[PDB]
Each structure stands twice: as C-alpha cells, then as structure tokens.
Design a protein around this ligand. Structure first.
Ligand SMILES: CC(=O)N[C@@H]1[C@@H](O[C@H]2O[C@H](CO)[C@H](O[C@H]3O[C@H](CO[C@@H]4O[C@@H](C)[C@H](O)[C@@H](O)[C@H]4O)[C@@H](O)[C@H](O)[C@H]3O)[C@H](O[C@@H]3O[C@H](CO)[C@@H](O)[C@H](O)[C@H]3NC(C)=O)[C@H]2O)[C@H](O)[C@@H](CO)O[C@@H]1O
Ligand SMILES: CC(=O)N[C@@H]1[C@@H](O[C@H]2O[C@H](CO)[C@H](O[C@H]3O[C@H](CO[C@@H]4O[C@@H](C)[C@H](O)[C@@H](O)[C@H]4O)[C@@H](O)[C@H](O)[C@H]3O)[C@H](O[C@@H]3O[C@H](CO)[C@@H](O)[C@H](O)[C@H]3NC(C)=O)[C@H]2O)[C@H](O)[C@@H](CO)O[C@@H]1O
Ligand SMILES: CC(=O)N[C@@H]1[C@@H](O[C@H]2O[C@H](CO)[C@H](O[C@H]3O[C@H](CO[C@@H]4O[C@@H](C)[C@H](O)[C@@H](O)[C@H]4O)[C@@H](O)[C@H](O)[C@H]3O)[C@H](O[C@@H]3O[C@H](CO)[C@@H](O)[C@H](O)[C@H]3NC(C)=O)[C@H]2O)[C@H](O)[C@@H](CO)O[C@@H]1O
Ligand code: NA
Ligand code: NA
Ligand code: NA
Ligand code: NA
Ligand code: NA
Ligand code: NA
Lengths: 597, 597, 597
C-alpha cells in the first residue's frame, strides 16, 4: 500500500510539502501546489488517462474543451497551451456554439495563455468556422454573457491557409460574444482566408473589451472571400491599441479593412497597417443598436501608421424600419497614412476620410456630425488620380478639418453625376496644408470639386503652398449646388497665373450670406480727367463685389490705377486713381475680389 | 522512517527531480522546484499548519501579511492571490501602517499577482481604511521607501459597497508611499465609497510609478464622501495610461475627479472616463513640494476620451508661508470630451480648461504659464448655459490654444462680479473652430466674456463658422478690464447682421499697443462735388481707427462711396468716393474697422 | 529499489498525479508537471549536478547558455531568471557571438523572464561586450535569424559601472540581430558606460521588434565613451513605446541620444527622457539599406516628454558609392520638450528639429521631404542663445510646421558662413505660436535667419504674440540666398515700433513669384491741391509693391493721407488723399506693404 499509493494518481497527494521549510507555512501536499496551475496536458489524454501527443493527426479540440469546462466549474483560472508544440483542431464543437460554426467554447473567468501554436486541420478546408466562441446559444439574442475572459501570450493561431469555399461563409478567430471585460494580448493570427480575426461584443452588448499588441498577418487569400475586417468592435468602452496588421494578397487591397468601430466610446490607437484596402470604419448601424443605444459617439482614431489602397477612415450611419443610427463626437488625429503604389483606379477610390453611403447605396439616411480631423498626414503618389483628402459621397451634417497636411490629387471630391449629398458644417481651416506631389497632374480637374446638392454653414479656406497651373480651378461649384451661409476663400499665393481660382457656375457667390474672396484678372478703363480720376471695369459681372484691391504692380509713371475698388449697380467695379497727366487709360490688373470679407 | 519522511512536510525535499531527464541539468528535489513559486495558500493556515479556506467569515489579512513579510525576507518575489476564490479582509494592520488606517503593508521587491478577488468585510463599514500601504511609519516624513513593488493581474479589489461614516475619513486602495518603480496593471477596483483608488508617491518623493490598464468602477456612492480623485500622482516621472474610469452616482458628478497630476514629468494618456465631475487636475501645491522641487513642469494630458459634468482639466498653483508653487510646460492634446446630459447649473460649471483658485479660494497666488492646448474636441449640449472652452477664474501667466474645436456656450468666460484675474499671454489662435450647437441660445451673453482685471500680451482671433445673432457680442471687455499690448480680431464671416461684434466698454481698443479689427455699421455723408468726392462718417467715435474698408455692395449707379477710409482728428472716418453726377450722398455701410492691422 | 528510485533524480517521475483529483484528467507523474516550467536553477550546477549558488565570485554565463541551448532544442519556452538573486556574468561566450564581443547567445522561441538581477563582473572592466546577442555568426551578413524571442519581467540588467577602455570599443545590452518578432518589456537597464542598451534588426533585416515599458538609467559615465544611443531601431515595423530614459552624466548631455529610427514603419511614442543630448534621430543611411530598401518612410515620433541639452529630432539621409538613402513621410506630433538649464553654447546647438549633415559633414546628399511637425511644444530658457525651432543645416526637400508652440531664441536658423543649404517646400503656417521667453535678448539677431543658398516653394507666416524690439528683424534673407515661388508675411501685431520687420538684403522680394507683406514706415509728401489730392513717397524703393495700406491714425483735421496706395514706375508709392484746405502736406506713416497678396 505505501508504494502503490505513491505510484498511483493520488501519490502526489501523499507527499508532504512546506514552502521553503518555513515552519510558519501551510503543511501541504505536492498535489496541492501542482493544482495551483493547469495546462492542456492535464486534459489531453485517452479514455485510460494516458497522455496523447499533439500533432497533425490528432484533434485536440475535445481536450481543450474539457479543460475549459473543468476550470470554469472551479470559478476560473488560466489554462496554458504549452510552448514547443502545435495543437491542431480538427472538428466542430457542439451545443450553443454550433450555430456559429464554433470550434471551442470560451467560458467566463477562464483565461487562455497561448504559448504554443494552435493550427486548423484540413477538415476545415472550404468550410466556415469560428475558432473560439463566447456565445452560449446559437441565437445571439438568447445567449448568456462572457465575462472576464483573456487570451494572451507569445503564441500563434494559424488558420491553415485554406480558402473559403463560398462567399456566403463566415470565418473568425475569436468571437467573444456578449462580452464584458474580455481581451486578446500578444497573439499572432496568421495564414488564413477569414472574415474577421476578432470580434468584440454583439449589437452593443458588452463592455471593456480590448485587442492589444496582437499581430494579424496574411488573413485574406482568395477571390471567394466576400469581405474582411480584422477586428470588429461591437460593444462600447472597447478598442484596439498597439497592433500590427499586414496583408500581401491582391484581394486584400480591394476588400480588407483593419478595424470596425461600431459603438460608443471606442478607439483605435497606435497601430500599423500595411496591404489593406481600408483602415477603419466608424459607423452606427441602426441594425446594431440594441445593446448600447442609437448613437456612436466618443470615437477615436489616433496615432496610427498606414499604407492602404482605398480609404483610411470611413464614416457612416443608417436606419432600419424602426431605428435610426447617429454618429457624432469623433476625433481622427496624429495618423500618418499613404496610398500605396498602384495604378489609378485599380482599387477603391483613395481617400483619407470617406463619407460613405449605407450598405445598400443610400446617401440620404446619414446623421454624421461633430467630427474633428486634425494633425494628420496623407500622401498619395502623383499618378493616383483617385486620391482625395475627403470623398464626400453621402449626406454630411458636419466635419471639421484643422492643421492637417494633405498631399493627393483632390482636397474635397465627389463624383459628378453620382450622389448629390446635402452638406452642412463642412469646415476646412486655412491651417490645412495642401501638398505639391500632384502639381502638373490636374488638367481638367478642380482641387475642391463641390459636386453636392447643397452646401450650408461651411468654410473652405484654400491655401496653396506651390503652383499648380494645370488645375482648372482651386474650387468649383456646379450650378446644381446651392451655396448659402458659407465662407469660401482662395489665398492669392501661387495663384497669379491661374485663369480660374474660384468658380461658381450658378453665380452662387452672390448670395446674401456668402462670404468670399479670390483673385481675378480685370480690365479697366479710366476717364480722361487729369488728377484724381475714376477707373471702371469693362465687364459687368461684379455686382456681388463689396471691395477689391490690386495684386499687380503699376509699370506706368504718368498715372496709377486705384489701389482699391468697390462696385456700381450695373456690375462694374469702380475706383479712384490718379492721372499725373490727363488721358484715357486702359489697364489689365490682377485683383483680389472680396464679398463681405 | 522512509514513509514517515515522505508523508511529513519535508517529504518533497526527499523526492529527486532532474528537468526533462536531462543529464546535464541540476539534480534537485521536488521541494526546490515548488519553492520557485509562492501563493497565499502557503501562508493561509491555522497554528497547526492546516490550510484555511477563505470566505466571508474568514479574515485573510494576517495570512497575506505573513506571506509578504516572508517573501520580503528573501529579497522579493511574486505572491499569487489565487483565481477562483474571494479573499476577505476583516481587520486593521499593525505598526507603521496603523497611522494610515492600513490593512496590508506592502514591502519592497514583493509583487502581488492578484488573480482572484480581494473583498472588504463589514468590519470596515462606516470606517476609514487604506487597503495596501507602502509607508512603513505612521508619519510619512519618517517613512522609509517602497521600491520595486508591482500589483498586477486579472483580479479585483472590491470595497464592499460601504459608505463613509464621516466626511473627514479617508479611504484608499493602494498607497504606494515614498514609492520608486511601483505599478498597478490590469486590476479592477470597484464597488466603494472612497477618497482615492491609488496614490503614487508622497509630496514629491518617489519616481517611475504607473497605473496601466486598470478599471475603476463605482467608487463614490454617498453624500458623506467629501471628495474623490481616483489616482493621485504625487511623484515625478510617473503616470496613468490606458485606464477605464466609470461612476454612476449622482454624487460622483459633483465631487469625483479621475486623476491628479501633482509633480513634474507626469502624464495621463489614452484613458476613458464616464460619470465623473472632473477629468484631471494639473497642479503644483506648495504644500507638496518637498521631494521634487517647487515646479510642476512637463505635464501631459493626451488622447483621452471623457464624459464629465464639470471640468476636464483644471490648472492650479499656490503658496504656503515658505514655499511658492509654479506650473509651467503643460500640453493638453488629442482629447475628446463632452459635458454629459444635464440641466444648466446642476453641476460645477462646465469647462474644457479651468484656471482655478486655490483650495481656500485665492485667485492671486497662481504662477501658471507655458501651457499648450491643441487638437482637442469639446462638446456641451445646447441647454448647458454653464459651458466654456476656458473658465479663467484665477491669475494666468500664459495659456495657448491652437487648432481645437470647441462647441459650447462660451469660449472664454469668467463670472462678473466675482474674481478679477490678472491675465497675461492668453493666446487664442484663429485655427480654433467655434461650433454651432449653442447658436440661438446666447441672448444677453458675450461669446468671449472678458471679465478680468487686466489683459496683456494676449491674442483673441475670433472666427465664427455659423451665425448666432442671439449673442450680445462676440467679445466684450468691461470698462474695469485694462487691455494693452494685445491683438483682438473678429473675422467678418457670419457677422453681417450683428449689432455688436467686439465691444470695449472702456474704449480700450484705443490703446497705443492694441491691435484690433472688427466689423461695424457706419453712416456716411458726402460733399456735393461732382467727381472725386469725400465721404465722412456722421459719428465721431473713430479716432482710434487706422483704416477701414467696405463690406457692403453699392446699389447705386450715379456714385460710389469709398472702398477704404482713414480717419481725422475729430474722430470721423473719411474716404474718397466718386460722384458721376453731383449731389450730397447719404449711405449706411458695413465696414471692417482696423487699428494697426 | 522503491526508496532508491524515489530519492534518485528520477523519483518525481514515479510519483503519480492527476489534476485536482479529476477522474477525467491525465494520469501524470510529478516530473511531467514540473517539466512545464524551467528556470536557471535547472542548469546552474556543477559537473556532479549539485546546485551552485550565484554570487559575485560565480560566473553564471555557461549555465544560462546551457539553459537557452536546451530549451531551444525543444522548440522554445520561457526561462525564469529567479527573483531574489543576483546572477553575475564573468566571461565571454563562444562561437558565432564572439565576433560581437557577446556574452549570451539568444535563440529563437526561447524567451527570458528576468525577475532577478543580471550583473556584469569586473572581468568586463575596460572591455567591449554585448550581453545578449541574437546573431549566430560573427559576420552579420552570414548570420541566421532570431525569431520569437522576448525578454520581459521586473528584473534588472546592471552594467557594473565600468568605464569604456577605449573609444573604439562597442558595448550593448541586447542585440537581437536579424530579428523577427522580438521584444523587451519591463526591464531596467542601469549603471553603465555603453554604446547602446538595445539594438533591433540589422541593416533593415528584421520585423516586429519592440521595446516597451523599459527603463534606461545612467548608461554613460565617461569621457572615453565615443557615442551613445539607447535604442537603435534597424528593422521595419518596429518601435519604442512607454519607456523611461535618464542620464545624470555631464558626458551624456554632449553625446547621448535616446532612440534611432533607421527603417520604415518605425515609431517612438509615449516616452520620457531626461539628461540626454538628443531625443531621436530619424535617418535613412544608405549603408543600412540592404534588408528593407532605400527609403525610410512612415516614421512617427509622438507624445513624448523630454528634457534634453541638444536637439530633440534630427533628420538625415545619405549616400554610398552605390546606394542613395531617402527620408520621407514623417510625423512629429504631441511632444513636449525643453532644453534643460545650461549656459549658452555649452552643449550642441539647441533645437526642436535639426536637419543635419551626414556623418562626414556633407550637406548636399540629403533627400528629406514630406515631414509634418504639428502640435508640439518647445521651450528653452532665455539665456540659451543657441536654441531654435529648426536648425536647417543641410539640403531640405520639404518640411511642414503647423500648430506648434515654439518658445526659444530662433524660429529658423542656420549659421552664417557655414553650410549653404538648398531649401524647398519649407512651410511655416501662421498657426505656429512664437513665445516670449527670449524677448529683449535678441540684439543683433534675426528671428528667422535665412542663411541658405536658396529657398523655393516655401511659406513663412510670421505671427508675434508679444513685442521684442531687441531683435534686428523678424526675418532676414542675405543677398546670397535666392528666393523664388515663396510666400513671406509678417503680421503687424506687436510690430509698430520695429525698425525692420522683413529684410531682403538682395531685394529678393521683387521676384516675379514672390508673395510678401510686411510693415514699414514711409514718408509721404502731397501736392498743394484742395480736395482729392495725391500723396507720394519721398523714397523710391517701392517698385515691387502692389498695394499698401495705413497702419497709423491721422492726427490732422484739415487733411487726410490716403488709406491705400499703389506704386509708380520710379518706385514711389502713390495714393489719393483729401485736403479739406489746400497746402503741401508731409507725413510719416506706418504702412502694410504688400506684393501680390
Ligand atoms: C466583414 C465586415 O466586417 N464587413 C463590414 C460590414 O459588416 C457587415 O457585413 C459583414 C459581412 O461579413 C457582417 O455580416 C455577415 O455576418 C452577420 C453576422 O453573423 C451572424 O451573427 C453572428 C453573431 C454569428 O456568429 C454568425 O454565425 C451569424 O449568425 C450576418 O448576419 C450577415 O448575414 C453576414 O453577411 C456584419 O455583421 C455583423 O458582424 C459582427 C461581427 O461578427 C456582429 O457583431 C454583428 O452582430 C453583425 N451585424 C449585423 C447587423 O448582423 C455586417 O454588419 C459593415 O456593415 C461595413 C460598414 O461598417 O463595413 C464592412 O464592410
Ligand atoms: C480627494 C482629492 O485628491 N482631492 C484633491 C485635493 O487634494 C487635497 O484634499 C484631499 C482631500 O481628500 C487630500 O487631503 C486629505 O488627505 C491629506 C493626506 O492624508 C494624510 O497623509 C497621508 C499620506 C496619510 O496616509 C493619511 O493617513 C493622512 O495622514 C490630509 O493631510 C488632509 O488633511 C486631508 O484633507 C489631499 O492630500 C494629499 O493626498 C495625497 C494622496 O493621498 C498625498 O500624497 C498628499 O501628501 C496630500 N497632500 C497634502 C498637502 O497633505 C489634498 O491635497 C487637491 O488639493 C485639489 C487640487 O488638485 O484637487 C482635489 O480636490
Ligand atoms: C551610437 C550610435 O548609435 N550613433 C549613431 C550613429 O551610428 C553610427 O555610429 C555608431 C557608433 O557606435 C555605430 O557604428 C559603430 O558600430 C558599427 C556596427 O558594429 C559592427 O556591427 C555590429 C552588428 C556588430 O555587433 C559589431 O561587433 C560590429 O562588428 C561599426 O561597423 C562601426 O565601425 C562603429 O563605429 C553605428 O553602426 C550601426 O550600429 C547599429 C546598431 O548596432 C547596427 O544595427 C548597424 O548595422 C550599424 N550600421 C553600420 C552602417 O554599420 C553607426 O551607424 C548614426 O550614424 C547617427 C545618425 O543617425 O546617430 C548616432 O550618432
Ligand atoms: Na449563426
Ligand atoms: Na441642388
Ligand atoms: Na494618517
Ligand atoms: Na482693472
Ligand atoms: Na564585430
Ligand atoms: Na545662393
């Protein structure tokens, strides 16, 4: 019996131990100390209790699930997935996670320290899957919560390289579910064709979920893949920080986004992206409003580094039959972004900010306002015609740009003959610096191409920092665009040789509450009078001008044109110059035309 | 004897072990390997060495203290507080921590990995307490240091929900003391009525202390609670990053602040706050200047998200009989903040920046300068009368605002008939965007209400981005406010219909070194002369004007008023217009009035 | 035999264990569970397998190397360096690391959890060393990679205080080598005279290497030390975050830099520096371009706090016989920096941004462009003559400044009679706020001292916020500096009493594509005519002026000078004023002179 007890599975339970021989310490057994930790080895055994080695011909799923289920039953703990081994998963889970194509069911308070590698076996080729699932019911609305579940370590989740079998399939790494205080830290997710790597929350249910110091590498690989967002943040008070995202696939340049921020008080910070179509969507979907209300507010995209092929930040909000979503109180700051090398029009239209339609193309459902875009840099190579600081493609209730540096083809753009957004409260401060990479590339183009239904309560203060005489105009409003209660200015620097600076194809600058200024060339004739003598414009399209002043030198000795002008009822400009000697004078002069400024 | 040895507490000390059967590895005993780790179980035992189960009727204090004391004696290590259990504390500690109402005494090099839960028992109801204390003497000035002490894990400190018994009591979670290289990471502090959750340092003594990835939830619950600051940073080279702070109590909206930054080279970054009165104080108290000098400099509040009811950042500095505190070299950047939904005047006056008096109400002791506030967003709902970008309530030696977006009732405010601050070096750049939420709400109010003793070396460049004809003025200086060596401008956009733009109730704009411009309506009469003809203002209050220019169109054919004006000794404006046909002219015109700009 | 087996090193291999008595768990032996972890104790033994205690007379090197080598052979894991002990290293390693003066060779997948202390023994006094080396060959070009190697914990690497023996020696803490997914977290590096603490990558080979939450304290101590950079980042997709850097040595104020960012997609964030010469270099060395190309792009320096004695960020790029390096797409944001207290000229010239020559002094090899410097604060005490926002000492292809607050002696500076940079695309937005600390200190100095060969496509919008009548000028161009296609403006506020505002010593403001404005004092005489009457300047150096306007009041009743002026062919200004009564008038007036603006 002594020997038999010691050799039996209860042997460690008979060997005494006291910490460091301290007579004040608990008199324990070895088993009690070993029981303070737990690994997959404690469950990775045959029906006789003999350990099984992991490998490509072993399905580790049931063993990991048994470990999770047991630790849960004791109120939680942390299960180690050992280093130096690859643990393969080769079958679906059962029960509530089956409605999610789930492999492993996560449980509250049960953390996973992944030090080794978790691979998917070829069972999963061409099939849907969600590797780790925190829902406990196939219907998320009927699911319980997942709380206090953290996945962390130096290890790896490898999706086996398998393509999707059909575009309608879904694949995920970690779905925390209705998740409260859950996180992923340090993990590398790689080698897949998946929809998401990590999802947080469900339709606003959850809180305090985070993804930190994770790597996401090569997670789209086929034309079958319908769509990819690496992290979907669908609960408030949650976010992504200090992560690395990389794709190499052509497909990823057309379909993949790094982050979705879909509920209030969410953030995306300090991360690096390469090879993606898109950086982040910041969106309130009415269809996702159940758990945390109808407003996405306190949305922060800061201090990221990106090389993308489409758009960096995409804003949206939409409606359902019974709910209306709203997006407000957003900050986009400190990001350094560029469109990677590509042919013009070879990926979705390049942009720093996109105001996008809804998923069904509607541009008249959005309620997006109180956005601050400040202190960012954007660059697109000179060949990329389709590059803009903002593509403004749906109704906009406000967006403010201050102190950014935008070096791309367009500043503000929307395609003509497409949507006709209603724009309010678009503010483009004079402190936005417009780069010169695309100088000479702009034939036929307007730098600010105001292809909108209407613009109200808006400010566009254009400041060039180099010449680009190729552009048709600095800013153009088609006659279809109403303009009211707005300030539009074009600083004169680098504009002396421009044929057109600001263009109002419907004469909209004449509006009662339109405040404008821009340079123009004007032909003047004087009267014959020696001495103080009036000069008048030969054209009559200045009835809107409140004052104008000279931007040209006077090469003459015997007279000078007026330094300043106002107008007359018939639309001429008039000012008082000086004839040292009499005579009718005729001059062409560059003027700053001003209205109410 | 073999069997007896094995079953005894030294048994593990007799069972040999060699790592992985490696013949090159140390020949050890099992006990040596078990001795590499340590948990509360190794000390949580009765006088006979039998383990005690934790629970609500067990006081775990003495056992945890014994563990800390023993590990300290070996030069440190990390004690695990096991997952799956709640460890209750039910008595005060003894010795040096007793003067701090202490429960547990922390010791140098002894880290706590809290995986389970630490609860306070009802012994503590209505009483003061500090759960973990790093002082070793009841007099902090006589205390030794705490160094290299880190508290981390997935676990919880729960304060038991108990109210304070008297407002004069103090409660804390972690007081590191005179703390060098100490930190808290990952811990949830919840369910309390406390003064602080964590304090770092003591009166400038300490260094390199941090709070990272912690949660602070529902830490004020009663009207008895005098005051709450969740983290008090009282040593240099220290800070708070990536934390979550939430309150639900009405009381918290009136009393609670998230962070105190009280010594140089301190920071508060990347955190989310909801339900608090205040975000952070940035203060140099003379009474706290012993350990790190009399200056708080290199103070950083960046990239936070907040919903508060009072003020986001509060600046201060003060004096004692023998020490003077100074605050300088501060940056507040990238924050997105809003005043939560509340009635006007129902909480402390809403503000992004407050320049506050000292704790005894004095407004003439401060030395605050070299502050940069840039790239932040602030919003307050339209009903909140008491909302301002800056409430400037005490003497200010400098503060600079660049490229912020402020959407609230006031830009600059101080209450009339209260303090009369002396203001120097207040810079409000034109790149600050003024939102429109409060348009139409401003009857009787001045957007910039300059209720100061004096303003010098200051810049206010007002730029509207929508109309608000309800306001009395854009900026007003009462006659009691001296103004000198300053630049005050009001851009004309959205101002055509304003009765008052800039108001100087003491004619201060006439100062020799005052540089101003703002719009006004002026009535002009001309002489009868055909040809070049002067126009003169009918009022005589323009003796300060250096130039003026038209902001109005000229509806006439037969004449034009001057485009530009200067003045005359008697205070009229004068300019040269043009009478195509003679006659006395009378016009009303909107002018930009300029002085030295 | 039972007893002998149990007492032998295989004893633990005979004692059965089953986790928590769970009948579903693996039937293991105690040794299997102990084998899940590994420490230095498992290798720190004599040839008979008896444990050796560490200490100052024990060389732990061979034991730690044996541990690393063994764990590597099993596919990796984490070796604990135990707390409560100091482990001394006292000899060089052997093999591939010997060409790097290496002590310990790191291996892939083998992490080090340093909880205790690692000290260098006096064997290393006056000698080179690299403590941990990830190269596997003495020739880095012939080295294999290091991957998945993480060093972390609460412990310490102490360099023993030893001085360098010769300036040509190199010393390092961690050289990861050709390093992929390697990191250091939490470690304190202290007490040394070293070249680097940590190097990441080798000549562009590597990826995803990081330094987080580390401390670097007193790592230069002698005049022998040639040069120090605490972290050298020489692989892409890598960076430094949330670290603390401190020096106390006089030598460090002249030689030490905190960070080198030398490859694309690298970052330096959230860190605090004190006592260093320099903050960070951001450089593309042609000599380092092998692994990741010839371009350093996506370079981010954000949200740091620093007290330095030289320059905060230094930009560079250079060439070799066959490679050309390029630097572009850089952002420097949110930093708060100051030059520490020191005498003028007592350390390298103080600067926020330096555009530095190459290591051999060449100023005509650089290709630096697309840089955004925004939302930073800089301060230097008033005595520090040698302090500038930017020292622009080498060719510059672009740099943009928006919304910074610079409080130092110079805004833009280069020494006269030194290099003559070619400058393109230097943009200084009007939103940069110029502080007043150095007011009254600027006798003989130009605030913007444009000591360049040429300036093109540049913008300098000078805005003062207080007077400084000591300065010679706000901006000066020597006649040797060509100026073209540029915008130079001096706002009038605080300039009324300045003798010189903008100075063009070669009359460069007359260029066809130069856009300028600045204040000047001008003497005017009128004709005798009653009524509208011309005024003309008595000097003739205004042939470049397109318009001018009054900045002065008119003290006269009987006449007024013109509000606005243009010029004439002979270089006079001319405008139309008004003589109520006739007579020749003579006045001196402050004008805003304008050219093409
Ligand atoms: C890839 C991506 O994120 N694309 C976003 C786009 O998101 C919408 O389209 C994607 C396409 O993959 C998602 O829609 C697919 O998935 C949902 C959800 O799956 C079901 O519910 C989950 C909980 C369960 O585990 C599954 O087994 C399914 O039963 C399907 O209902 C839908 O038919 C399918 O096309 C995405 O859905 C959201 O997904 C997140 C993350 O898993 C969930 O938290 C949300 O509950 C779910 N929302 C809805 C309303 O169901 C779609 O929302 C965005 O719309 C767009 C703008 O931001 O950006 C990208 O294109
Ligand atoms: C809640 C808060 O932080 N409020 C700040 C306000 O801070 C001042 O008022 C609070 C009120 O709670 C503190 O004053 C109380 O506590 C001090 C300190 O307690 C004593 O010393 C500690 C070390 C010991 O452990 C205790 O047992 C006590 O013996 C009392 O002296 C005082 O009478 C009492 O009202 C706060 O004191 C500071 O507290 C921090 C954190 O613990 C300590 O590091 C400092 O040493 C201590 N300072 C002083 C000068 O004693 C008061 O400073 C701020 O003044 C205000 C502006 O920033 O913001 C909030 O209102
Ligand atoms: C201290 C510092 O970082 N200074 C930078 C300056 O950097 C250059 O000068 C330093 C002086 O210490 C380095 O040059 C010294 O070291 C190199 C490299 O050592 C050799 O290669 C390594 C891999 C091996 O382990 C060693 O045993 C050596 O065989 C010597 O070649 C050189 O002769 C010597 O003066 C620095 O070199 C770079 O160092 C990093 C970090 O270790 C390596 O990753 C690079 O491969 C290596 N580069 C080159 C081209 O060899 C020099 O580049 C910067 O130039 C300057 C501008 O940024 O800022 C600071 O002054
Ligand atoms: Na499903
Ligand atoms: Na329309
Ligand atoms: Na006390
Ligand atoms: Na006064
Ligand atoms: Na070498
Ligand atoms: Na030259």
């Amino acid at each position: 019996q002594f020997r038999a007890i010691i050799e039996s599975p209860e042997g460690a339970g008979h060997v005494g131990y006291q910490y460091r021989r301290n007579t004040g310490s608990t008199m324990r057994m070895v088993s009690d100390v070993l029981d303070e930790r737990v690994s997959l080895w404690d469950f990775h055994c045959d029906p006789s209790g003999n350990v099984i080695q992991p490998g490509p011909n072993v399905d580790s799923r049931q063993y990991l699930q048994a470990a999770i289920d047991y630790v849960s039953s004791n109120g939680g703990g942390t299960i180690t997935i050992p280093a130096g081994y690859t643990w393969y998963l080769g079958s679906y889970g059962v029960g509530g996670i089956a409605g999610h194509s789930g492999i492993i069911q996560l449980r509250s308070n049960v953390n996973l320290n992944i030090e080794g590698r978790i691979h998917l076996s070829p069972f999963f080729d061409l099939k849907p899957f969600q590797v780790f699932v925190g829902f406990d019911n196939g219907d998320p609305a009927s699911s319980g919560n997942l709380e206090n579940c953290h996945i962390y370590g130096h290890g790896v989740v490898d999706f086996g390289g398998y393509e999707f079998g059909a575009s309608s399939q879904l694949r995920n790494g970690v779905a925390f579910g209705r998740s409260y205080n859950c996180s992923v830290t340090g993990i590398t997710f790689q080698n897949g064709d998946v929809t998401w790597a990590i999802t947080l929350g469900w339709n606003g249910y959850g809180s305090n979920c985070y993804v930190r110091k994770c790597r996401f590498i090569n997670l789209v690989n086929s034309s079958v893949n319908a769509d990819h967002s690496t992290v979907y943040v669908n609960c408030p008070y949650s976010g992504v920080e200090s992560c690395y995202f990389s794709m190499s696939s052509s497909f990823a340049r057309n379909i993949a986004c790094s982050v979705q921020l879909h509920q209030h008080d969410t953030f995306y910070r300090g991360s690096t992206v390469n090879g993606y179509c898109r950086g982040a969507y910041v969106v309130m979907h009415a269809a996702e409003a159940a758990g945390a209300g109808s407003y996405a507010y306190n949305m922060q995209v800061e201090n990221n580094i990106a090389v993308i092929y489409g758009q960096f930040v995409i804003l949206g909000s939409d409606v359902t039959a019974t709910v209306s979503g709203h997006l407000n109180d957003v900050i986009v700051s400190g990001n350094i972004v560029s469109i990677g090398e590509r042919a013009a029009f070879s990926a979705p239209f390049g942009a720093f900010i996109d105001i996008g339609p809804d998923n069904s193309g509607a541009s008249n459902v959005q309620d997006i306002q109180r956005v601050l875009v400040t202190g960012n840099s954007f660059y697109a190579p000179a060949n990329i015609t389709d590059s803009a600081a903002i593509t403004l493609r749906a109704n906009l209730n406000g967006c403010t740009f201050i102190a950014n540096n935008f070096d791309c083809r367009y500043m503000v753009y929307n395609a003509p003959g497409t949507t006709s957004p209603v724009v309010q409260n678009l503010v483009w401060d004079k402190s936005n610096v417009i780069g010169g990479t695309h100088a000479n590339q702009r034939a036929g183009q307007n730098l600010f191409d105001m292809q909108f239904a209407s613009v109200v309560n808006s400010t566009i203060e254009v400041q060039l920092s180099c010449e680009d005489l190729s552009m048709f105009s600095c800013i153009l409003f088609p006659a279809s665009c109403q303009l009211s209660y707005s300030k539009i200015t074009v600083d004169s620097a680098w504009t002396k040789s421009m044929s057109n600076t600001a263009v109002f194809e419907g004469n909209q600058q004449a509006g009662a509450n339109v405040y404008v200024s821009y340079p123009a060339t004007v032909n003047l004739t004087s009267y014959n009078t020696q001495g103080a003598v009036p000069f008048f414009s030969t054209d009559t399209n200045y009835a809107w001008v409140t004052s104008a002043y000279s931007l040209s030198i006077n090469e003459n000795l015997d007279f000078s044109p007026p330094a300043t002008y106002t107008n007359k009822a018939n639309g001429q400009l008039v000012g008082v110059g000086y004839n040292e000697i009499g005579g009718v004078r005729s001059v062409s002069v560059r003027l700053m035309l001003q209205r109410q400024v």
